[PDB]
Design a protein around this ligand. Structure first.
Ligand SMILES: [Cl-]
Ligand SMILES: [Cl-]
Lengths: 111, 113
C-alpha cells in the first residue's frame, strides 16, 4: 500500500557520473522533501519544494510537474562520499506537520 | 492501518508535566528509532532501539514490550524547547536502509505561571 513510491531502491554509480532518484505519488501532493541520512541516522533535509526546482552544489531537485505526481533528485558528478541512504517524503496539505515517507534509496558510488 | 502508526497525532501539555508518545506496529519489528524534526525540517535522531530501554536527559524510550509490538517515548518535566514534531520509524524488512515511518506527532509545550 504505497502512496509514495521511491525509485530506484538501490543503485550503484561510478564516481563522476550523474543519476536521478524519483519519488512517485499516487495523488497530487502539496510539497516534497528530500533527505540524506547522516552517520548518526538523522534524516538531514536536502530540499523542500512546493513546486519548481531547486539546486545546491552538485544536487538538484524538481517538482515542476503539472499534476505533481512525482519529484526527482538529481546527483551530478557523484562522489564516494555521496554513498548512503536517501529518502523523500510528501506533504498532502499546504501546512500539515504530517509527512508520508518513501521507502528509501541505497546509493553506492564506486571509485 | 499501515505498518506503523503514531499516537497521539498532536498534544499540548504544560511545562513541567510528563507525557508519552506511542509507535504502534501491525507486526514485530527488529528496531525502532525516534526523531524530533528541527526548524529546517530535518528528522534528528533521538534514540535507536533494538530492545530494552534508553534514557538521555528528560527523554526515555522503551522497546521492551510484547516482543516488538510497540515503542514509547516518554518526555518528563517538559520544557518549552521540547515543542516540535516527533517521528518514529521501524525496521522490519532488510537491514538499516528502508525504514517505515509514523505520520508524526505535533507536541506543544505551554508556559505556566
Ligand atoms: Cl544529527
Ligand atoms: Cl539540519
Amino acid at each position: 500500500g504505497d502512496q509514495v513510491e521511491q525509485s530506484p531502491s538501490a543503485l550503484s554509480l561510478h564516481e563522476g557520473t550523474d543519476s536521478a532518484l524519483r519519488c512517485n505519488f499516487t495523488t497530487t501532493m502539496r510539497s516534497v522533501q528530500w533527505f540524506r541520512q547522516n552517520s548518526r541516522g538523522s534524516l538531514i533535509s536536502l530540499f523542500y519544494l512546493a513546486s519548481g526546482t531547486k539546486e545546491n552544489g552538485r544536487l538538484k531537485s524538481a517538482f515542476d510537474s503539472k499534476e505533481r505526481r512525482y519529484s526527482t533528485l538529481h546527483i551530478r558528478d557523484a562522489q564516494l562520499e555521496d554513498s548512503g541512504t536517501y529518502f523523500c517524503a510528501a506533504e498532502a496539505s499546504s501546512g500539515a506537520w504530517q509527512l508520508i515517507f518513501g521507502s528509501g534509496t541505497q546509493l553506492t558510488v564506486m571509485p
